[PDB]
Amino acid sequence: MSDASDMLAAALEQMDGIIAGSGSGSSPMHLQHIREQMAIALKRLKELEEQVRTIPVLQVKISVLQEEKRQLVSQLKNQRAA
């Protein structure tokens, strides 16, 4: 359970408070704090962008196993027929 989405939501909320506060809160610490949270979210985002690339691969691997199973089933059925 990654907290990345919550850290980005939190940094987004602070950013909204600064924008609605006419740039107040743009302190070096607060900007660095928001920055660090943005970095956590980005790193998790890139890991997820790589992960979802594997879903199409897993789906084809499943179709391969289904065809391999299907060929075994037909051979088993024919042998059981005679």
- The answer to whether 17 contacts its own copies (rule: CB under 8 A) is no
- The answer to whether 27 contacts its own copies (rule: CB under 8 A) is yes
Tokens of 80: 């059981």
- Cα-flanking dihedrals φ and ψ of residue 25, to 5°? 90, 0
For 41, residues 6+ apart whose C-beta sits below 8 A from its C-beta are 4, 5, 7, 8, 11
Length of the chain: 82
Interaction with its own copies in 31-60: which residues (CB under 8 A)?
Answer: 31-32, 34-35, 38-39, 41-42, 44-46, 48-49, 51-52, 54-55, 58-59
- Distance (Å, whole) CA 64 – CA 73: 14
Provide the binding-site residues for its own copies, judged by CB under 8 A.
Answer: 2, 4-5, 8-9, 11-12, 15-16, 18-19, 22-23, 26-28, 31-32, 34-35, 38-39, 41-42, 44-46, 48-49, 51-52, 54-55, 58-59, 61-62, 65-66, 68-69, 72-73, 75-76, 79-80, 82
